[PDB]
Amino acid sequence: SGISLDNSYKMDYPEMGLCIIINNKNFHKSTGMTSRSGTDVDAANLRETFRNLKYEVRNKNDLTREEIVELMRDVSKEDHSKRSSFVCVLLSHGEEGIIFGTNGPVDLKKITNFFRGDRCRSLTGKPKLFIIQACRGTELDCGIET
Template sequence: MSLSKIQDFMKNTKGNLIRHFDSIINSCRPRSRIRRLHSTSSNGSSGSTDMESYPVLPGQRGFLIIINNTNNRKGSEKDYDNVHSFFKGTLNYKEKYINNPTLKILKNFLEKITAHLESNANNYFGIFVFIMGHGDKDDQIKIQGGVIPVDDIISYFTNDRLRKFAGKPKSFFIQACRGSTIQDGVETDAINSAVPIDADIFKFYATTPGYTSHRVMTEGSWFIIDLIKVFKKRYRYKPLQIMCTEVNHVVAKRSASVNDKKQMPIIVSTLCKSLYLIYQGK
């Protein structure tokens, strides 16, 4: 082989090696950690947008409210234990609990809480309310001596009532029947602009309208059991909306031992951002 051919061979080999190592270095460079949601525009073209999250500042906690009716609801104490253990024990949320209240006592309880929240808004990034009791087709919860509509409870926390929480998330988890039909299975911080009164509300019902919800006397209700299990597994890195969709999936797979009866939770939401249960360190 002539000297010129040897020189050409060495030059080509060197170039190939340089390109090879460049590709290795590029593959090792860190990629952006910005999470994007892919979307499709009205003309069908695909794109991506950043999904903003509700702010959770260092030192801020969630505020947990549990309204429970244990009368003739064997196993409901297990639901309280599950909710309390996770939100208070694991997440260290501030907790207020009331059991078997009359309408007057419940209203007084809610008024005191909302007054506290308005006076201490900087301490909390969001509000989480569990409403557990017997329910009916009109979305009313039975309490001592009467009933109260779920929306009457929620009305204490809307942006016109809690102005210092405007723009902050308020989440409601309703463990109650919404009718008497048993469902069958089938095969297969500061806001600089006005916000709607009912914005930033998240409602998660144990079942769809018209149907019963299932409760096991020795364990608690399907909805609360599966909700807490999913939250414990995912809360560090998944937003509430994604976790609750997984709860839908898990509960929907359950079947009652009698006649293969089912249950389907439902989400009703006016949240405008992703909601994480803890500070994300961003």
Template structure:
């Protein structure tokens, strides 16, 4: 009896940034690397086949999503992006923006038939504005939000849900221990919340971040509010495994990281 196809997860984490001329333009994102590795292990334990990549340029990130159009997929496609960002875009390690609308266009039913009927779930850990742009551990890399930022949501393809770490116009907190948002996601995936419908899980994440987290130091008391956007027409349970979670010592081919990882950002 053939083994059912595994759902796929693509995780991209950018921690070190330099422009094409070699100038370091943005601060390193301490804590993001370890956090992404924990997420990849948890998803592998939930029977996902995980592809984890570090420090990719905007163009390389775009190509990665194009490659998903020719992959074999199970019931779900999950993608986590952890990087600097601005409203409507995430930044590659070359400091260049990749518009989220471009990613959604690549994975649309017209361009990616293999994922047309499969739920696609995105978690975006990146700034969406400069409202918190002076903190030591705040990702303060973008300008003011665009007046028509809501139009970005119109590009989300059918059967897609996107959860942002913060609301439009605001920054996303990160410190060496990790980010408020992805730490809450890790706790949910490792706990009972993983059995919930995605919309209910997102509500729990909102509460965990908005009510249970706050900045310290110079920004003592500052808060962060995630934002969940979906056009899924029904409840989905992407993290509710049919059986027991896989042992942490046996990923069953769930990782695709070996030759992909690079220590330094590449120029475009």
């Protein structure tokens, strides 16, 4: 055939892939964390948006740190052979490199490692996207007048 460049990911597999949305609104009193009002609006907006992009959206609400890890591990062990990509949206409280489950923190590294090129072969060479709505510290931006 003619010249082939391979500058963009192959996104024409039978399925676009999964879009896992973890929506943590209510946290265990024992953690002292407050509820995240308005997160349900985000979760719904994301579901509709990615539905229109032809993703297989799976939503989960108020997951403990254990359930987050179990969910991610389970999803990474699925056969993604016929899927073009993978998307995971995390909506919760957080700190640098951390996302909070309803009963404690989860290292983002722990979550993403399940999808490493060597640990999830059916996703090797395919785009793995993690959208994170959470704090990354306690700094505030005062901004500047334009």
